[PDB]
Design a protein around this ligand. Structure first.
Ligand SMILES: CC(C)=CCOc1cccc2c1-c1c(c3c(n1C(C)C)CCCC3=O)C2=O
Ligand code: NA
Length: 334
């Protein structure tokens, strides 16, 4: 009949136990400031519905980042603001500093702490084995925190991880697709970016949870240790699942589809084929072997699972042997 329901393994009911105001972002009241407190310096980039600038706060002469919002869906503005406010001060989460509107155009804009960034298309080429572990651990702190706060990021990818490599500091940005987890809710599956979409999104299983972010993180890890960007390189959403099935195999895929009684789109009927689950040594060569270890492969394998329930949680991930050296060095504070 219908799809089998599902619930997050961790942090299942945390929003239910909050006051309504925590997650009911539609009724949040915004105190809009004056963008004239800020002078734009230069354009830094763009989002799917935003343009991002370096700016100067002319009151205290501090450098900030201004994100001007022009979304197709409007209530998305209060959602992002409310999620950013709930998460403010959490480890490795971008800090929302102010919320303003241009006095003329009335266009809303978010003001953030400034962070430097090197584009991952030139930074990841220089990361050592240790650096990958260190920064993966920093991302996991951010994800464990926001999951523990009842929030799925739903857009984890290199472009959304700002790294100041000189100061070894990392921030997870762009919370515009983030959402509150509520058990039993059916979410939009047209989230995240193609190369980082979890199988639940590709097969249209809507009752997903925080474990979506852990798939995306596994895609990032695979591209870093194997030096293959992206790791799953699909032409479209349907071929994206084919690329995954050629690596993880079709047996576990059809068991997953069976377990949740998922109705598979007929387009997949003639393109998934039959594929074995490949051993990870198949992707190791002389150019990436210094980043690959038994610990790295054991950790990666535990993130990239079809069944979202069987993926590591962020906190389970942080206890994996792959991070023992980072944990020990963090304790002695170095
Ligand atoms: C120094 C350089 C070149 C980049 C640092 O870019 C920062 C720094 C602090 C804070 C943020 C960004 C940023 C944000 C956002 C984006 N970017 C960048 C990637 C343009 C892209 C769109 C979505 C979004 O939200 C954001 O909140
Ligand atoms: Na983005």
């Amino acid at each position: 009949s219908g799809p089998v329901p599902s619930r997050a393994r961790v942090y299942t009911d945390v929003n239910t136990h909050r006051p309504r105001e925590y997650w009911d972002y539609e009724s949040h009241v915004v105190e809009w400031g004056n963008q004239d407190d800020y002078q734009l310096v230069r354009k830094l980039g763009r989002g799917k519905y935003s343009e991002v600038f370096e700016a100067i706060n002319i009151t205290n002469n501090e450098k900030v980042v201004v994100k001007i919002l022009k979304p197709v869906k409007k209530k998305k503005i209060k959602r992002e603001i409310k999620i950013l406010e709930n998460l403010r001060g959490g480890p490795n989460i971008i800090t929302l500093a102010d919320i303003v509107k241009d006095p003329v155009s009335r266009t809303p804009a978010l003001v953030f702490e400034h962070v430097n960034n090197t584009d991952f298309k030139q930074l990841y080429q220089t990361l050592t084995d240790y650096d990958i572990r260190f920064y993966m651990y920093e991302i996991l702190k951010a994800l464990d925190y926001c999951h523990s706060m009842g929030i799925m990021h739903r857009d984890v990818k290199p472009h959304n991880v700002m790294i100041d490599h000189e100061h070894r500091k990392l921030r997870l940005i762009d919370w515009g697709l983030a959402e509150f987890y509520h058990p039993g809710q059916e979410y939009n599956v047209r989230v995240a970016s193609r190369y980082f979409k979890g199988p639940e999104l590709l097969v249209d299983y809507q009752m997903y949870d925080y474990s979506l972010d852990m798939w995306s993180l596994g895609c990032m890890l695979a591209s870093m240790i194997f030096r293959k960007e992206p790791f799953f390189h699909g032409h479209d959403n349907y071929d994206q699942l084919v690329r995954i099935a050629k690596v993880l195999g079709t047996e576990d895929l059809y068991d997953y589809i069976d377990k949740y009684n998922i109705e598979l789109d007929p387009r997949f009927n003639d393109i998934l084929g039959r594929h074995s689950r490949k051993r990870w040594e198949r992707f190791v060569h002389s150019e990436n072997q210094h980043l690959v270890s038994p610990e790295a492969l054991d950790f990666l394998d535990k993130l990239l699972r079809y069944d979202h329930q069987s993926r590591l949680t962020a906190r389970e991930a942080m206890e994996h042997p792959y991070f023992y050296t980072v944990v020990k060095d963090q304790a002695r504070m170095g």
